[PDB]
Amino acid sequence: RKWEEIAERLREEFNINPEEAREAVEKAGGNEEEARRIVKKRL
């Protein structure tokens, strides 16, 4: 188990903070489609 590949794809699509990519994947539980929503903080 590693949350890397998904967070490493989230930085490729979105120039964000590392913590954003790392949170998106861990809160989605390794689900890329749900992490694809959580990665986008509107703010």
C-alpha span between 22 and 34 (Å, rounded) = 13
| Solving technique | NMR
Distance of CA 7 to the CA centre of its chain: 5
Domain locations in the chain? Answer: 1-43
Sole residue written with tokens 């929503």: 37
Contact criterion met (CB below 8 Å) for 20 and 39: yes
Q: Assign 40 to helix, strand or coil.
A: coil
Maximum pairwise Cα distance, the chain: 31
Contact criterion met (CB below 8 Å) for 22 and 8: no
